[PDB]
Design a protein around this ligand. Sequence first.
Ligand SMILES: CCCc1c(OC2CCCCC2)c2cc(Cl)ccc2[nH]c1=O
Ligand SMILES: [Mg+2]
Lengths: 399, 516
Amino acid sequence: TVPVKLKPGMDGPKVKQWPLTEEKIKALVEICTEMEKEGKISKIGPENPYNTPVFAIKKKDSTKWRKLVDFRELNKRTQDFWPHPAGLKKKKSVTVLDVGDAYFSVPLDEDFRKYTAFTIPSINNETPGIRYQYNVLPQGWKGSPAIFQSSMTKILEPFRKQNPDIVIYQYMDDLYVGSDLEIGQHRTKIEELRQHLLRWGPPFLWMGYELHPDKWTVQPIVLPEKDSWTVNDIQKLVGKLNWASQIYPGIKVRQLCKLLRGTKALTEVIPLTEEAELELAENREILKEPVHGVYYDPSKDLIAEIQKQGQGQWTYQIYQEPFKNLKTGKYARTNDVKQLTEAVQKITTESIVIWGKTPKFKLPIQKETWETWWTEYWQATWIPEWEFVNTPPLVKLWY
Amino acid sequence: PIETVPVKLKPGMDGPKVKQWPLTEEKIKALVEICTEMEKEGKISKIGPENPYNTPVFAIWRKLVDFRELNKRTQDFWEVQLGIPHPAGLKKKKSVTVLDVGDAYFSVPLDEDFRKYTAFTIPSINNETPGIRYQYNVLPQGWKGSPAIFQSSMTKILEPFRKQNPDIVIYQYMDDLYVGSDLEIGQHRTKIEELRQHLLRWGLTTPDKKHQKEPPFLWMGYELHPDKWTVQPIVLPEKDSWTVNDIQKLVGKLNWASQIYPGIKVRQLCKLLRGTKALTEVIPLTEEAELELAENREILKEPVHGVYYDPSKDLIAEIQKQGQGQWTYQIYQEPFKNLKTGKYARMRGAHTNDVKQLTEAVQKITTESIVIWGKTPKFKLPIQKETWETWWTEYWQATWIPEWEFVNTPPLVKLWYQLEKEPIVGAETFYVDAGYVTNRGRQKVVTLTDTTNQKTELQAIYLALQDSGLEVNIVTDSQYALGIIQAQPDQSESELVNQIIEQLIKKEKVYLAWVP
Ligand SMILES: CCCc1c(OC2CCCCC2)c2cc(Cl)ccc2[nH]c1=O
Ligand SMILES: [Mg+2]
């Protein structure tokens, strides 16, 4: 076992466990009891003050439950370990696998184990709670991939050289396999990697279906193209523009603001003077593309804000610096939460594929709610960092 | 015996090296007799000069060792993290007997390597002679880990007998141990003695049936029966003179009841606390506070009881609006026969509306149920799908309500107004900023005293609303008020806003837009 330590001075996590539903508790008991028989985990005593939260998520196309341990806090307190392919995002098709099980073979430093402590809560506090800690490398922990890196490269060296037309990228418990082969040949080539993995020690995440990164779109800002223009129309037009101007300073409003001189009635239709007509058309051109000069700082946190546009439609933006969006997109349908989770997961997967990191989200929801339902629809094997917020009116309308 | 739990001092800390206060020779005398017994019983063992550690002791004749220091130097344990059950979560039992575990800490070995830190000293009576030193072999009463470690043990010790007797449930709590079954009186009283035996097996002495405790179980503000439950009988005072303090307590005492006594209202009482300058200040009761007191008094005069959980049946949660800001609910399984009830005053944010507030109540109940019954109940709400959905869809924040049924029980929640999704033709147009100017030439410039930048922004809008006709388009630069109103509140802590809200309810169509 490799000696792993927490960053210097840092102690272990003591995270509260969110109340789970009887159903999930059951799933977890079933699961954990077997992981014990197989000695992957071991009941711990009171001498262990640490604790990480566990959850039961659902497997897509499988009646089976998956245990999901929120090692977020742990990973943050875990020492760093001492390369992302820019080509991956370019492949036509990317398939994601769950090689999480690979870790269950490698033992965890007996001295670090205490920090993997987790607990199966009890209903109504009627029982103490089933406490356990990991003997092997735990899924979801930042160490595991690293420590398994080695045996991981060895396992892939054959397929990699046999199929160098294929890009294989691992992230935590996931393996990203991208290519450009025909879709049929893909799934076929994918399936082959599988048995080549079984040959050493893996389900299709995201439905066994493919991401198509190449087709990923950057939703630019858009302006209302319309027949006749009323005072209100323009007022909004000028507003939306006025805003966007902070990003693309080449935006001029002058001529439009001129049509809006004098307390006219909102509904009154205002014809556009050629001068303004062209000003708009220019503003239109400027927006056609993302503002130049926006580069990804590997050293900076990747942030992600989501907005609810109603009807099952959402808008998101990935940036590191304000107004300096690295990416933006939309998402269409379910209920508010289901969608919102699906989104985050979509936005994360991409974030990973592209930059190899997970973004920190800002969610348009009350925490108690998110805490309550999110697990009911979550399917990833990772959990991004998130915070909860209140979406400003204008900025929603502007997307 | 029991598997030992390994202990350590907090990183980079040494054992307590604290000096023993002088002790009345009469006190020296009683300690020796006491300590000698403990050594005769194995609990402690005299030690040598090897050990530099020491923890102060004193007599109360009983013994007490001050472990504060040792505690500050002792590692943190996964604690008893007390989170107690709520009666509504329990299931009915035929018999439930509790056993008081005889000195359990003294019955549990102590990690060898640690014992040395538990060292203390009994001063000798005469000057030239040294006093006897000791350390523990078992859980020291008053020591940091004793509880966690004691319970832990207990649990492992109860595992076997627990899986061997499925038809039995045991709830551990400090020294108490509760055993329940739907077993025959004797057949139950049987298993009990079966247990006591198994406990004795590891040396844990429990009370005799002649001396055990039987229901009702008055525990943590509750009164527990085999088939039912409630709150310890609460009695309202009958004073002429009410102090801020008496009031504050009463209100507290009233809230407590709310979880089972529906209809308890504290508004008028709580109102009494306004302005108060001291806990001893006498506040005379208002006429409506009297009525409230009197009303609750009567509500409390009826011994209502709670029912237990039938895992078999479903959970139904019903909610009502006990008045602006107040919501009442009751979770039942069997038709209008609760397990629990409760209120909700929780106003989240300065402004809000019934739809939102009710939705928030659903989330509390939801959260609360998962904690007590492990599942969410089907809800019966006084709002209709269309209404909800209409608010739902148009709100920037995401939200989701479990499975729910509309129950036509006034008052039904609704929206007293909605903003036009598009400017109104034929309606006058106002431009606000403190004043307004309209496309029709009208204008009013008013001077506000004590206002705040934002409160000025609303006044304008208010003004405009006032002066405008049944239909109005309003144009503002205030992004704030916009948000406020777009939110569509129907109650606010700000008087101003309520006025506006009233105006809004009255109009036929209002269109609000924002411009820089
Ligand atoms: C021991 C199992 C928990 C449990 C009870 O024990 C109680 C637990 C809380 C402390 C007091 C005793 C219980 C007590 C009564 Cl009086 C009636 C029904 C009950 N149903 C139950 O599931
Ligand atoms: Mg203006």
